[PDB]
């Protein structure tokens, strides 16, 4: 049972961060066709999601549509 929403990355190269900006700590960088999982709804262009047990963000352009 699954119940999270699936997102892949779509550009290149995605920074991860620690806050919904770009002033903020890159916790790591994604890749084309990683994927991220998360339950929350998009903000101001940036979605909220656990990465490696912390909280972060990316910026949702870099992303696919939700699956
Ligand atoms: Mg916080």
Do not use: C, M, P
């Not at 998009?42 to 699956?67: I, P, R």
């Amino acid at each position: 049972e699954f119940t999270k929403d699936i997102y892949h990355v779509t550009a290149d190269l995605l920074n991860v961060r620690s806050e919904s900006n770009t002033e903020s700590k890159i916790l790591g960088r994604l890749k084309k066709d990683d994927v991220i999982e998360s339950t929350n709804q998009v903000k101001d262009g940036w979605l909220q999601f656990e990465y490696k047990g912390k909280t972060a963000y990316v910026n949702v352009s870099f992303l696919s549509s939700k699956a």
